[PDB]
Amino acid sequence: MNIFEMLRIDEGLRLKIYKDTEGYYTIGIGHLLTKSPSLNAAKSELDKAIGRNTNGVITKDEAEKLFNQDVDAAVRGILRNAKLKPVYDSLDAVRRAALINMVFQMGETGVAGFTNSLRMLQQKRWDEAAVNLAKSRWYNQTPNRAKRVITTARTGTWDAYK
Numbered sequence: 001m002n003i004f005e006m007l008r009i010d011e012g013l014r015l016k017i018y019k020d021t022e023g024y025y026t027i028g029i030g031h032l033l034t035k036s037p038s039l040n041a042a043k044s045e046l047d048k049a050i051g052r053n054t055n056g057v058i059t060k061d062e063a064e065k066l067f068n069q070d071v072d073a074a075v076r077g078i079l080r081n082a083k084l085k086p087v088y089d090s091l092d093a094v095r096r097a098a099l100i101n102m103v104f105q106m107g108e109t110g111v112a113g114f115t116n117s118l119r120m121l122q123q124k125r126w127d128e129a130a131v132n133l134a135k136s137r138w139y140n141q142t143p144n145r146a147k148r149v150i151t152t153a154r155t156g157t158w159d160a161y162k
């Protein structure tokens with residue numbers, strides 16, 4: 001398992017414009033397009049992202065291409081963030097994947113705000129971190145996914161994804 005397979009499980013794959021768990025227009029493997037309520041706006045943003053007139057539909061390759069960019073941007077965002085980087089650098093490889101997933105889902109900003117969980121993770125206080133991470137809107141809104149990612153961070157193993 002790796003980061004890509006992990007997020008592909010969490011986000012799924014849809015070839016047509018859809019609304020995510022928050023009601024926002026998205027496409028592919030969780031590629032958010034816009035927070036705006038306008039389908040046209042979403043359509044405009046999709047065509048600009050792809051490079052062609054898609055009419056709200058993309059191919060599998062195009063979806064994977066956007067996912068690749070999105071995963072890359074997630075890592076680079078961690079690495080450029082003064083609160084995130086040091087956590088990330090202290091972790092082992094599986095736990096790092098948990099942090100990338102969160103960032104992909106909620107943005108650098110949102111994740112950089114889990115101050116307390118970040119410190120416990122940096123200190124290797126697994127169980128405490130896990131408890132702290134679950135005290136969040138994130139977990140109350142998307143609990144099945146949150147649980148998988150939290151167990152990943154807590155155990156350093158991929159069990160939640162088997």
Ligand SMILES: [Cl-]
Pocket residue numbers: 049
């Ligand atoms: Cl883009």
Ligand SMILES: [Cl-]
Pocket residue numbers: 141142143144145146
């Ligand atoms: Cl969920």
